[PDB]
Amino acid sequence: ASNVTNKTDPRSMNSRVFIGNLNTLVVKKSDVEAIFSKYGKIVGCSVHKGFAFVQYVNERNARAAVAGEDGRMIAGQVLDINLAAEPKVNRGKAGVKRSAAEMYG
RNA sequence: AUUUUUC
């Protein structure tokens, strides 16, 4: 698949997958487009430090991997997968941080 | 080598 995943169209912002807390020191672009291609047609993919991105053809494909791979282990670590326009995590760089509305009370 | 963008 292509190397592009940063569009901002009203259907490309929800046909995309965010992949945080990723084992980016063992994974590669040829791995991310091979771990998420089982849940949809990838037409763009990119990888960075601590996170990566995947661009599907539609939103249905994104919900397939955002609910099909989220919380899975790869290369010995777990990755936090979510819709690219529906962030809920505090981006605490470890997943240990909580929201002021989701605290222990 | 470590959570929203071109590895």
Maximum Cα–Cα distance across chain A? 46
Number of Cβ atoms within 10 Å of the Cβ of A69? 18
Taking the CB of residue A11, how many other CB atoms lie within 10 A of it?
A: 11
Give the Cα separation of A16 and A81 in Å (integer).
Answer: 11
A32 to A9, A47, A86, A89: CA distances (angstroms) = 22, 8, 20, 21
Nearest one of A28, A29, A6, A23 to A85, comparing CA atoms: A6
Q: How was this structure determined?
A: NMR
* Structural domains of chain A, count: 1
- For residue A33, report the phi and psi dihedrals to the nearest 5 degrees: -80, 5
For residues A42 and A5, the answer to whether their CB atoms sit within 8 Å is: no
Contacts of strand B, CB cut-off 7 Å?
A 3-7, 13, 16, 18, 20-25, 28-29, 44, 46-51, 53, 77, 80, 82-87, 89, 91-95
Q: How far apart are CA A5 and CA A16, in angstroms?
A: 7
Residue with tokens 């291609």: A37
Range of the domain at A94: 1-105
CATH code of the domain covering residue A15: 3.30.70.330
